CSV table of C-alpha atoms in Angstrom, one decimal:
chain,number,residue,atom,x,y,z
A,4,UNK,CA,61.8,1.5,-24.7
A,5,UNK,CA,65.1,0.1,-25.9
A,6,UNK,CA,65.4,0.5,-29.7
A,7,UNK,CA,68.0,-1.6,-31.7
A,8,UNK,CA,69.9,0.3,-34.4
A,9,UNK,CA,70.6,-1.6,-37.6
A,10,UNK,CA,72.3,-0.6,-40.8
A,11,UNK,CA,72.6,-2.5,-44.1
A,12,UNK,CA,74.8,-1.7,-47.2
A,13,UNK,CA,72.6,-3.1,-50.0
A,14,UNK,CA,75.1,-2.3,-52.8
A,15,UNK,CA,78.0,-4.7,-52.1
A,16,UNK,CA,77.9,-8.4,-51.3
A,17,UNK,CA,80.1,-9.5,-48.4
A,18,UNK,CA,80.0,-13.1,-49.7
A,19,UNK,CA,77.6,-15.9,-50.7
A,20,UNK,CA,74.6,-16.7,-48.7
A,21,UNK,CA,74.6,-20.4,-47.8
A,22,UNK,CA,71.5,-22.4,-48.5
A,23,UNK,CA,70.9,-24.2,-45.2
A,24,UNK,CA,67.0,-24.3,-45.4
A,25,UNK,CA,66.6,-28.1,-45.3
A,26,UNK,CA,63.8,-29.9,-43.5
A,27,UNK,CA,62.1,-33.2,-42.9
A,28,UNK,CA,58.5,-34.3,-42.8
A,29,UNK,CA,55.7,-35.4,-45.1
A,30,UNK,CA,54.6,-32.5,-47.3
A,31,UNK,CA,51.5,-34.0,-49.0
A,32,UNK,CA,49.6,-37.3,-49.4
A,33,UNK,CA,51.1,-40.4,-51.1
A,34,UNK,CA,49.5,-43.8,-51.7
A,35,UNK,CA,49.1,-45.5,-48.4
A,36,UNK,CA,49.7,-42.3,-46.5
A,37,UNK,CA,46.8,-40.0,-47.6
A,38,UNK,CA,45.5,-38.6,-44.4
A,39,UNK,CA,48.0,-35.8,-44.2
A,40,UNK,CA,47.3,-32.2,-45.4
A,41,UNK,CA,48.8,-31.0,-48.6
A,42,UNK,CA,51.3,-28.3,-47.5
A,43,UNK,CA,53.8,-28.6,-50.4
A,44,UNK,CA,53.1,-25.1,-51.6
A,45,UNK,CA,54.3,-23.8,-48.2
A,46,UNK,CA,57.6,-25.6,-48.6
A,47,UNK,CA,57.8,-24.0,-52.1
A,48,UNK,CA,57.1,-20.6,-50.7
A,49,UNK,CA,59.7,-21.2,-47.9
A,50,UNK,CA,62.2,-22.1,-50.7
A,51,UNK,CA,63.1,-25.4,-49.0
A,52,UNK,CA,66.3,-26.6,-50.7
A,53,UNK,CA,66.9,-30.0,-49.0
A,54,UNK,CA,64.5,-32.7,-47.7
A,55,UNK,CA,65.5,-35.6,-45.4
A,56,UNK,CA,63.4,-38.6,-46.2
A,57,UNK,CA,63.4,-40.3,-42.8
A,58,UNK,CA,60.0,-39.3,-41.8
A,59,UNK,CA,58.4,-40.6,-45.0
A,60,UNK,CA,57.1,-44.1,-45.3
A,61,UNK,CA,60.4,-44.9,-47.2
A,62,UNK,CA,62.4,-47.3,-45.0
A,63,UNK,CA,64.5,-50.2,-46.1
A,64,UNK,CA,63.3,-52.6,-43.4
A,65,UNK,CA,65.7,-55.4,-42.4
A,66,UNK,CA,62.8,-57.9,-42.0
A,67,UNK,CA,59.8,-58.5,-44.2
A,68,UNK,CA,57.3,-55.7,-44.0
A,69,UNK,CA,54.7,-54.6,-46.6
A,70,UNK,CA,55.6,-50.9,-46.4
A,71,UNK,CA,59.3,-51.4,-46.7
A,72,UNK,CA,61.2,-50.5,-49.9
A,73,UNK,CA,62.0,-54.2,-50.3
A,74,UNK,CA,59.0,-55.9,-48.7
A,75,UNK,CA,60.0,-59.5,-49.2
A,76,UNK,CA,63.6,-60.4,-48.6
A,77,UNK,CA,63.2,-63.7,-50.4
A,78,UNK,CA,62.4,-61.9,-53.7
A,79,UNK,CA,64.7,-61.5,-56.7
A,80,UNK,CA,66.7,-58.3,-56.0
A,81,UNK,CA,67.3,-57.8,-59.7
A,82,UNK,CA,63.6,-57.5,-60.6
A,83,UNK,CA,62.0,-54.0,-60.2
A,84,UNK,CA,58.8,-55.8,-59.3
A,85,UNK,CA,60.5,-56.8,-56.0
A,86,UNK,CA,60.7,-53.2,-54.9
A,87,UNK,CA,58.0,-51.0,-53.4
A,88,UNK,CA,58.7,-47.5,-54.8
A,89,UNK,CA,55.3,-46.1,-55.2
A,90,UNK,CA,54.8,-43.9,-52.2
A,91,UNK,CA,58.5,-42.9,-52.1
A,92,UNK,CA,58.3,-42.0,-55.8
A,93,UNK,CA,55.5,-39.7,-55.0
A,94,UNK,CA,57.4,-37.8,-52.3
A,95,UNK,CA,60.5,-37.7,-54.4
A,96,UNK,CA,58.6,-36.2,-57.2
A,97,UNK,CA,56.9,-33.7,-54.9
A,98,UNK,CA,60.3,-32.6,-53.5
A,99,UNK,CA,61.9,-32.3,-57.0
A,100,UNK,CA,58.9,-30.3,-58.3
A,101,UNK,CA,59.7,-27.4,-55.8
A,102,UNK,CA,63.4,-27.5,-56.7
A,103,UNK,CA,64.7,-29.2,-53.6
A,104,UNK,CA,67.4,-31.8,-53.3
A,105,UNK,CA,66.9,-35.0,-51.3
A,106,UNK,CA,68.8,-36.5,-48.3
A,107,UNK,CA,67.7,-40.1,-48.5
A,108,UNK,CA,68.0,-41.9,-45.1
A,109,UNK,CA,68.7,-45.6,-45.4
A,110,UNK,CA,67.1,-47.0,-42.2
A,111,UNK,CA,65.0,-49.9,-41.0
A,112,UNK,CA,61.4,-49.5,-39.7
A,113,UNK,CA,62.3,-47.8,-36.4
A,114,UNK,CA,60.8,-48.3,-33.9
A,115,UNK,CA,59.0,-51.4,-34.9
A,116,UNK,CA,62.2,-53.1,-36.0
A,117,UNK,CA,65.9,-52.1,-35.5
A,118,UNK,CA,67.6,-55.4,-36.3
A,119,UNK,CA,70.7,-55.3,-38.4
A,120,UNK,CA,70.8,-56.9,-41.9
A,121,UNK,CA,70.7,-60.7,-42.0
A,122,UNK,CA,72.2,-61.1,-45.5
A,123,UNK,CA,74.8,-58.3,-46.1
A,124,UNK,CA,75.5,-59.2,-49.7
A,125,UNK,CA,71.7,-59.0,-50.6
A,126,UNK,CA,71.3,-55.9,-48.5
A,127,UNK,CA,74.0,-54.2,-50.6
A,128,UNK,CA,72.5,-55.3,-53.9
A,129,UNK,CA,69.1,-53.9,-52.8
A,130,UNK,CA,70.6,-50.6,-51.7
A,131,UNK,CA,72.4,-50.2,-55.0
A,132,UNK,CA,69.2,-50.7,-57.1
A,133,UNK,CA,67.3,-48.3,-54.8
A,134,UNK,CA,70.0,-45.8,-55.7
A,135,UNK,CA,69.8,-46.7,-59.4
A,136,UNK,CA,66.1,-46.2,-59.3
A,137,UNK,CA,66.4,-42.7,-58.0
A,138,UNK,CA,69.6,-41.7,-59.8
A,139,UNK,CA,69.8,-43.6,-63.1
A,140,UNK,CA,66.1,-44.2,-64.0
A,141,UNK,CA,66.2,-47.9,-63.1
A,142,UNK,CA,62.9,-49.6,-62.8
A,143,UNK,CA,60.9,-46.7,-64.2
A,144,UNK,CA,62.8,-44.3,-61.9
A,145,UNK,CA,64.2,-40.8,-61.7
A,146,UNK,CA,67.3,-39.2,-63.2
A,147,UNK,CA,69.6,-37.5,-60.6
A,148,UNK,CA,66.8,-37.1,-58.0
A,149,UNK,CA,68.8,-37.9,-54.9
A,150,UNK,CA,72.2,-36.2,-54.3
A,151,UNK,CA,72.8,-37.3,-50.7
A,152,UNK,CA,72.5,-40.7,-49.2
A,153,UNK,CA,72.6,-41.1,-45.4
A,154,UNK,CA,73.1,-44.3,-43.5
A,155,UNK,CA,71.8,-44.4,-40.0
A,156,UNK,CA,69.5,-42.7,-37.5
A,157,UNK,CA,70.6,-42.3,-33.8
A,158,UNK,CA,72.4,-45.6,-33.4
A,159,UNK,CA,73.7,-44.3,-30.1
A,160,UNK,CA,70.2,-43.6,-28.8
A,161,UNK,CA,70.3,-46.6,-26.6
A,162,UNK,CA,69.2,-49.7,-28.5
A,163,UNK,CA,66.0,-48.0,-29.6
A,164,UNK,CA,67.1,-47.3,-33.2
A,165,UNK,CA,69.7,-49.9,-33.8
A,166,UNK,CA,69.9,-53.3,-31.9
A,167,UNK,CA,72.9,-54.7,-33.8
A,168,UNK,CA,76.5,-54.3,-32.7
A,169,UNK,CA,78.7,-51.4,-33.8
A,170,UNK,CA,80.7,-53.8,-36.1
A,171,UNK,CA,77.4,-54.7,-37.7
A,172,UNK,CA,76.5,-51.1,-38.1
A,173,UNK,CA,79.9,-50.3,-39.6
A,174,UNK,CA,79.8,-53.2,-42.2
A,175,UNK,CA,76.3,-52.0,-43.2
A,176,UNK,CA,77.6,-48.5,-43.6
A,177,UNK,CA,80.4,-49.8,-45.8
A,178,UNK,CA,78.0,-51.8,-47.9
A,179,UNK,CA,75.8,-48.8,-48.5
A,180,UNK,CA,78.8,-46.5,-49.3
A,181,UNK,CA,80.1,-49.0,-51.8
A,182,UNK,CA,76.7,-49.3,-53.4
A,183,UNK,CA,76.1,-45.5,-53.7
A,184,UNK,CA,79.6,-44.9,-55.1
A,185,UNK,CA,79.3,-47.8,-57.5
A,186,UNK,CA,76.2,-46.2,-59.0
A,187,UNK,CA,77.7,-42.7,-59.3
A,188,UNK,CA,80.9,-41.4,-57.7
A,189,UNK,CA,79.4,-37.9,-57.7
A,190,UNK,CA,76.8,-39.0,-55.1
A,191,UNK,CA,77.5,-37.9,-51.5
A,192,UNK,CA,77.3,-40.7,-48.8
A,193,UNK,CA,77.5,-40.2,-45.1
A,194,UNK,CA,76.2,-40.9,-41.6
A,195,UNK,CA,75.7,-42.1,-38.9
A,196,UNK,CA,73.3,-39.4,-37.5
A,197,UNK,CA,74.8,-39.2,-34.1
A,198,UNK,CA,72.1,-38.5,-31.5
A,199,UNK,CA,74.5,-37.5,-28.7
A,200,UNK,CA,77.3,-35.5,-30.5
A,201,UNK,CA,79.1,-34.4,-27.3
A,202,UNK,CA,79.3,-38.0,-26.1
A,203,UNK,CA,82.2,-40.2,-26.9
A,204,UNK,CA,81.2,-43.7,-28.1
A,205,UNK,CA,81.2,-46.4,-30.8
A,206,UNK,CA,79.0,-44.2,-33.1
A,207,UNK,CA,81.2,-41.2,-32.8
A,208,UNK,CA,84.9,-42.1,-32.3
A,209,UNK,CA,84.3,-45.7,-33.2
A,210,UNK,CA,82.5,-44.8,-36.4
A,211,UNK,CA,85.2,-42.3,-37.5
A,212,UNK,CA,87.9,-44.8,-36.6
A,213,UNK,CA,86.3,-47.5,-38.7
A,214,UNK,CA,85.8,-45.4,-41.9
A,215,UNK,CA,89.4,-44.2,-41.5
A,216,UNK,CA,91.0,-47.6,-41.0
A,217,UNK,CA,88.9,-49.3,-43.7
A,218,UNK,CA,89.2,-46.3,-46.1
A,219,UNK,CA,85.4,-46.1,-46.5
A,220,UNK,CA,84.0,-42.9,-48.1
A,221,UNK,CA,82.5,-40.4,-45.7
A,222,UNK,CA,81.3,-37.3,-47.6
A,223,UNK,CA,79.4,-35.9,-44.6
A,224,UNK,CA,79.2,-36.7,-40.9
A,225,UNK,CA,75.6,-36.3,-39.8
A,226,UNK,CA,74.4,-35.5,-36.3
A,227,UNK,CA,71.5,-34.0,-34.4
A,228,UNK,CA,70.8,-31.3,-31.7
A,229,UNK,CA,67.7,-30.0,-29.9
A,230,UNK,CA,67.3,-26.9,-27.7
A,231,UNK,CA,65.2,-28.6,-25.0
A,232,UNK,CA,67.6,-28.0,-22.1
A,233,UNK,CA,69.0,-24.7,-23.2
A,234,UNK,CA,66.3,-22.9,-25.3
A,235,UNK,CA,69.5,-21.2,-26.7
A,236,UNK,CA,69.5,-20.7,-30.5
A,237,UNK,CA,73.3,-20.4,-30.4
A,238,UNK,CA,73.6,-24.2,-29.5
A,239,UNK,CA,73.8,-25.3,-33.1
A,240,UNK,CA,76.9,-23.2,-33.8
A,241,UNK,CA,78.5,-24.3,-30.5
A,242,UNK,CA,77.9,-28.0,-31.2
A,243,UNK,CA,79.1,-27.9,-34.8
A,244,UNK,CA,82.4,-26.4,-33.8
A,245,UNK,CA,83.0,-29.3,-31.4
A,246,UNK,CA,82.0,-31.9,-34.0
A,247,UNK,CA,84.2,-30.2,-36.6
A,248,UNK,CA,87.2,-30.6,-34.3
A,249,UNK,CA,86.6,-34.3,-33.7
A,250,UNK,CA,86.0,-35.0,-37.4
A,251,UNK,CA,89.2,-33.1,-38.3
A,252,UNK,CA,91.1,-35.1,-35.7
A,253,UNK,CA,90.5,-38.2,-37.7
A,254,UNK,CA,91.9,-36.5,-40.8
A,255,UNK,CA,88.4,-36.0,-42.5
A,256,UNK,CA,89.0,-32.3,-43.2
A,257,UNK,CA,87.1,-32.4,-46.5
A,258,UNK,CA,84.0,-34.1,-44.9
A,259,UNK,CA,81.0,-31.8,-44.5
A,260,UNK,CA,79.0,-31.5,-41.3
A,261,UNK,CA,75.3,-32.3,-41.8
A,262,UNK,CA,72.8,-31.3,-39.1
A,263,UNK,CA,70.2,-34.0,-39.7
A,264,UNK,CA,67.8,-32.8,-37.0
A,265,UNK,CA,67.5,-29.4,-35.4
A,266,UNK,CA,64.7,-27.9,-33.5
A,267,UNK,CA,64.0,-25.9,-30.3
A,268,UNK,CA,62.6,-29.1,-28.9
A,269,UNK,CA,63.0,-32.8,-29.7
A,270,UNK,CA,61.4,-34.3,-26.6
A,271,UNK,CA,57.9,-35.5,-27.5
A,272,UNK,CA,56.3,-34.1,-24.3
A,273,UNK,CA,57.9,-30.6,-24.8
A,274,UNK,CA,55.7,-27.6,-24.1
A,275,UNK,CA,56.3,-24.1,-25.6
A,276,UNK,CA,54.6,-21.1,-27.0
A,277,UNK,CA,54.1,-21.0,-30.8
A,278,UNK,CA,55.6,-17.5,-31.0
A,279,UNK,CA,58.6,-18.2,-28.7
A,280,UNK,CA,59.5,-21.2,-30.9
A,281,UNK,CA,59.2,-19.2,-34.1
A,282,UNK,CA,61.6,-16.5,-32.8
A,283,UNK,CA,63.9,-19.3,-31.7
A,284,UNK,CA,64.1,-21.0,-35.0
A,285,UNK,CA,64.7,-17.8,-36.9
A,286,UNK,CA,67.5,-16.8,-34.5
A,287,UNK,CA,69.0,-20.3,-34.8
A,288,UNK,CA,69.0,-20.2,-38.6
A,289,UNK,CA,70.7,-16.7,-38.4
A,290,UNK,CA,73.4,-17.9,-35.9
A,291,UNK,CA,74.1,-21.1,-37.7
A,292,UNK,CA,74.7,-19.3,-41.0
A,293,UNK,CA,78.1,-18.4,-39.5
A,294,UNK,CA,79.1,-21.9,-38.3
A,295,UNK,CA,80.7,-25.2,-39.2
A,296,UNK,CA,77.2,-26.5,-40.3
A,297,UNK,CA,77.3,-27.2,-44.0
A,298,UNK,CA,73.8,-28.5,-44.4
A,299,UNK,CA,70.9,-28.4,-42.0
A,300,UNK,CA,67.5,-30.2,-41.7
A,301,UNK,CA,64.9,-28.5,-39.5
A,302,UNK,CA,62.7,-30.9,-37.6
A,303,UNK,CA,60.0,-31.0,-38.8
A,304,UNK,CA,58.0,-28.9,-41.3
A,305,UNK,CA,54.7,-30.8,-41.2
A,306,UNK,CA,51.8,-31.5,-38.8
A,307,UNK,CA,54.0,-33.9,-36.8
A,308,UNK,CA,51.8,-36.8,-37.8
A,309,UNK,CA,54.4,-39.6,-37.3
A,310,UNK,CA,53.6,-42.9,-39.1
A,311,UNK,CA,56.5,-44.8,-37.5
A,312,UNK,CA,55.8,-44.0,-33.8
A,313,UNK,CA,52.1,-43.4,-34.6
A,314,UNK,CA,51.5,-40.2,-32.7
A,315,UNK,CA,51.6,-36.4,-33.4
A,316,UNK,CA,55.1,-35.1,-32.6
A,317,UNK,CA,55.0,-31.6,-31.2
A,318,UNK,CA,58.1,-30.8,-33.2
A,319,UNK,CA,55.8,-30.6,-36.2
A,320,UNK,CA,55.4,-26.9,-36.7
A,321,UNK,CA,52.0,-26.9,-38.6
A,322,UNK,CA,48.7,-27.3,-36.8
A,323,UNK,CA,47.1,-30.8,-36.8
A,324,UNK,CA,44.9,-29.8,-39.8
A,325,UNK,CA,47.7,-28.2,-41.8
A,326,UNK,CA,47.0,-24.6,-41.0
A,327,UNK,CA,49.6,-22.0,-40.2
A,328,UNK,CA,50.9,-20.1,-37.3
A,329,UNK,CA,54.0,-18.1,-36.1
A,330,UNK,CA,56.3,-21.1,-36.5
A,331,UNK,CA,55.3,-21.8,-40.1
A,332,UNK,CA,55.5,-18.0,-40.7
A,333,UNK,CA,59.0,-17.8,-39.4
A,334,UNK,CA,59.9,-21.0,-41.3
A,335,UNK,CA,58.9,-19.3,-44.6
A,336,UNK,CA,60.6,-15.9,-43.9
A,337,UNK,CA,63.8,-17.7,-42.9
A,338,UNK,CA,63.9,-19.8,-46.1
A,339,UNK,CA,63.2,-16.8,-48.3
A,340,UNK,CA,66.1,-15.0,-46.6
A,341,UNK,CA,68.4,-18.0,-47.0
A,342,UNK,CA,67.4,-18.3,-50.7
A,343,UNK,CA,69.1,-15.0,-51.5
A,344,UNK,CA,72.5,-15.5,-53.1
A,345,UNK,CA,74.5,-12.5,-52.2
A,346,UNK,CA,74.8,-11.9,-48.4
A,347,UNK,CA,74.8,-8.2,-47.4
A,348,UNK,CA,76.4,-6.6,-44.4
A,349,UNK,CA,74.0,-5.9,-41.5
A,350,UNK,CA,75.5,-4.3,-38.4
A,351,UNK,CA,73.9,-3.9,-35.0
A,352,UNK,CA,72.5,-7.3,-34.1
A,353,UNK,CA,73.8,-9.2,-31.1
A,354,UNK,CA,74.5,-12.7,-30.0
A,355,UNK,CA,71.9,-12.6,-27.1
A,356,UNK,CA,68.8,-13.3,-29.3
A,357,UNK,CA,68.4,-10.1,-31.4
A,358,UNK,CA,69.6,-11.8,-34.6
A,359,UNK,CA,69.6,-10.1,-38.0
A,360,UNK,CA,70.6,-11.3,-41.5
A,361,UNK,CA,70.5,-9.6,-44.9
A,362,UNK,CA,70.9,-10.7,-48.5
A,363,UNK,CA,69.9,-9.9,-52.1
A,364,UNK,CA,68.7,-12.0,-55.0
A,365,UNK,CA,70.9,-12.9,-57.9
A,366,UNK,CA,69.1,-10.5,-60.2
A,367,UNK,CA,69.8,-7.7,-57.8
A,368,UNK,CA,66.1,-6.5,-57.6
A,369,UNK,CA,65.2,-7.8,-54.2
A,370,UNK,CA,66.8,-7.1,-50.8
A,371,UNK,CA,65.7,-9.2,-47.8
A,372,UNK,CA,66.4,-8.3,-44.2
A,373,UNK,CA,65.4,-10.9,-41.5
A,374,UNK,CA,65.2,-9.9,-37.8
A,375,UNK,CA,64.4,-12.1,-34.9
A,376,UNK,CA,63.9,-10.8,-31.3
A,377,UNK,CA,64.3,-13.9,-29.2
A,378,UNK,CA,64.9,-14.1,-25.4
A,379,UNK,CA,66.3,-17.1,-23.6
A,380,UNK,CA,63.9,-17.6,-20.6
A,381,UNK,CA,65.4,-16.8,-17.2
A,382,UNK,CA,65.4,-20.3,-15.9
A,383,UNK,CA,67.7,-21.3,-18.7
A,384,UNK,CA,70.2,-18.7,-17.8
A,385,UNK,CA,71.2,-20.5,-14.6
A,386,UNK,CA,74.3,-22.6,-14.8
A,387,UNK,CA,73.9,-26.3,-14.2
A,388,UNK,CA,75.7,-28.1,-11.4
A,389,UNK,CA,76.7,-30.7,-14.0
A,390,UNK,CA,76.5,-30.2,-17.8
A,391,UNK,CA,74.5,-33.3,-18.5
A,392,UNK,CA,70.9,-33.4,-19.5
A,393,UNK,CA,68.8,-36.3,-18.2
A,394,UNK,CA,65.4,-37.2,-19.6
A,395,UNK,CA,62.8,-40.0,-19.8
A,396,UNK,CA,62.0,-42.0,-22.8
A,404,UNK,CA,65.9,-42.8,-18.7
A,405,UNK,CA,68.7,-41.3,-20.7
A,406,UNK,CA,71.5,-38.7,-20.5
A,407,UNK,CA,73.7,-36.7,-22.9
A,408,UNK,CA,76.5,-34.2,-22.6
A,409,UNK,CA,75.3,-30.6,-23.2
A,410,UNK,CA,77.5,-27.5,-23.5
A,411,UNK,CA,77.7,-25.1,-20.6
A,412,UNK,CA,74.8,-22.7,-20.6
A,413,UNK,CA,75.6,-19.1,-21.8
A,414,UNK,CA,74.7,-17.5,-18.5
A,415,UNK,CA,75.5,-14.0,-19.8
A,416,UNK,CA,73.2,-14.3,-22.9
A,417,UNK,CA,70.2,-12.6,-21.4
A,418,UNK,CA,68.2,-10.7,-24.0
A,419,UNK,CA,68.8,-6.9,-24.3
A,420,UNK,CA,65.1,-6.5,-24.1
A,421,UNK,CA,64.6,-4.4,-27.3
A,422,UNK,CA,61.0,-3.4,-27.9
A,423,UNK,CA,61.7,-2.2,-31.5
A,424,UNK,CA,64.3,-1.3,-34.1
A,425,UNK,CA,65.2,1.2,-36.6
A,426,UNK,CA,67.0,0.0,-39.8
A,427,UNK,CA,68.9,2.1,-42.3
A,428,UNK,CA,69.5,0.5,-45.7
A,429,UNK,CA,71.9,2.4,-48.0
A,430,UNK,CA,73.2,2.1,-51.5
A,431,UNK,CA,70.2,0.3,-53.0
A,432,UNK,CA,71.9,-1.4,-56.0
A,433,UNK,CA,69.4,-0.3,-58.7
A,434,UNK,CA,69.9,3.4,-57.7
A,435,UNK,CA,67.7,6.2,-56.4
A,436,UNK,CA,64.6,5.4,-58.5
A,437,UNK,CA,61.3,4.0,-57.3
A,438,UNK,CA,61.3,1.1,-54.8
A,439,UNK,CA,58.8,-0.9,-52.7
A,440,UNK,CA,59.2,-1.6,-49.0
A,441,UNK,CA,57.1,-4.6,-47.7
A,442,UNK,CA,57.1,-6.0,-44.2
A,443,UNK,CA,56.1,-9.5,-43.1
A,444,UNK,CA,55.6,-10.5,-39.4
A,445,UNK,CA,55.4,-13.8,-37.4
A,446,UNK,CA,54.6,-13.3,-33.8
A,447,UNK,CA,51.8,-13.9,-31.2
A,448,UNK,CA,49.3,-12.1,-33.5
A,449,UNK,CA,50.6,-12.9,-37.0
A,450,UNK,CA,51.6,-16.0,-39.1
A,451,UNK,CA,54.1,-14.5,-41.5
A,452,UNK,CA,51.6,-12.4,-43.6
A,453,UNK,CA,52.4,-9.0,-45.0
A,454,UNK,CA,51.7,-6.2,-42.5
A,455,UNK,CA,52.2,-3.0,-44.6
A,456,UNK,CA,54.0,-1.6,-47.6
A,457,UNK,CA,54.7,1.6,-49.4
A,458,UNK,CA,56.6,2.9,-52.4
A,459,UNK,CA,59.3,5.6,-52.3
A,460,UNK,CA,62.4,6.9,-54.1
A,461,UNK,CA,66.0,7.4,-53.2
A,462,UNK,CA,68.9,5.0,-52.8
A,463,UNK,CA,68.5,4.9,-49.0
A,464,UNK,CA,65.5,3.8,-46.9
A,465,UNK,CA,64.8,3.9,-43.2
A,466,UNK,CA,62.4,1.3,-41.7
A,467,UNK,CA,61.4,1.3,-38.0
A,468,UNK,CA,58.9,-0.8,-36.1
A,469,UNK,CA,58.0,-2.0,-32.7
A,470,UNK,CA,59.0,-5.7,-32.4
A,471,UNK,CA,58.6,-7.2,-29.0
A,472,UNK,CA,60.5,-10.3,-27.9
A,473,UNK,CA,59.3,-13.5,-29.6
A,474,UNK,CA,58.7,-11.8,-32.9
A,475,UNK,CA,60.2,-12.3,-36.4
A,476,UNK,CA,60.2,-9.7,-39.1
A,477,UNK,CA,61.2,-9.7,-42.8
A,478,UNK,CA,61.7,-6.4,-44.6
A,479,UNK,CA,61.7,-6.8,-48.3
A,480,UNK,CA,62.9,-3.9,-50.6
A,481,UNK,CA,62.3,-4.3,-54.3
A,482,UNK,CA,63.0,-2.3,-57.5
A,483,UNK,CA,59.8,-0.8,-58.9
A,484,UNK,CA,59.6,-1.3,-62.7
């Protein structure tokens, strides 16, 4: 029995906690998409802070399409009646009602249609009034509902998401950026959602070169990463460092890095245990808290019901019927930890999958200590002959060298000493929540005590996630 030894100083912040708990997916029914469960309250309890809109039925299709935001491209682009906002309005309102911001992805109806825009001038006008609808109340719209506007989704994923040329993609990006900034310079615009971020190409170097040479705004560079071929929660930090270096190389030192998709698996035939995945995503969140990632979108916090490809994506962490499990439990405990504002020092975790993170709320009355015990499986600790991952859709991408020395320490439990509780030595409450092979994030036990220090110990086998919550008792 190997027992990890953790210590937290609860009385002094080391710095600000960074709110990286973004996600994508459909949280509740909307007109025309009413078959999905209502899980919006779970997003609220998880303290989701950012929602990518791409998986909604909220596409700006480049041909005529009833479900598109502009369904008839012959219609008057100045008339609100020409726009189809109803379902998107519902999802925007749902997202704002839980206090989350929106990353609105401007994209065609992938995969049914990936053609570029036929009429760039009209495309630009239509993008601008979509923005005005969600930012300036245009056409019975919202005020300041969408802070981030993304153009693109995996243009380098073969021709499966974009069938135009790179030049056509770049001009479309510039039109969208012009329209967003014309509505409100304070809005953030970016792209292109690189699918293969360690691969040179027209949508990495060629995209950065274009926005530089043509002086196009780029508030964030967006990209994706999945753990399919590593199962290593460290990957997101590793990739972000490399992306940061390439973006800086083009002079874009103020541009943020936005992780538009991240998941243990992104291959639609991937197989995994619920509890392994839960521990992975908690460890990944902890590791990327110290990284070049500035904003992150977990893929995907719903049932995986995909109304574009018309299947159930296994990356959807909820059960088909909306019910909960270890993944949804870990998702909530992570978000609650990331919602603290003052990060606290925790010492004794490691970089081989026993990840720990501590923080306290702004009012000082709640300490949260998040612990994931995750083990990279043995078969993923073998170095590859060649650091390229090949998969069927036949495609290939560059992957980082595997961390062959990152085998789990194999802890079976932990003891945790929290000192200097900030409200003093009076009454406090200790509550523990667990997501593992037997639990879905619910509370396991609790007690009340006194003193400015508290010691907590538990068995916590690999593939388990635990949240320790310490509160002042009134």
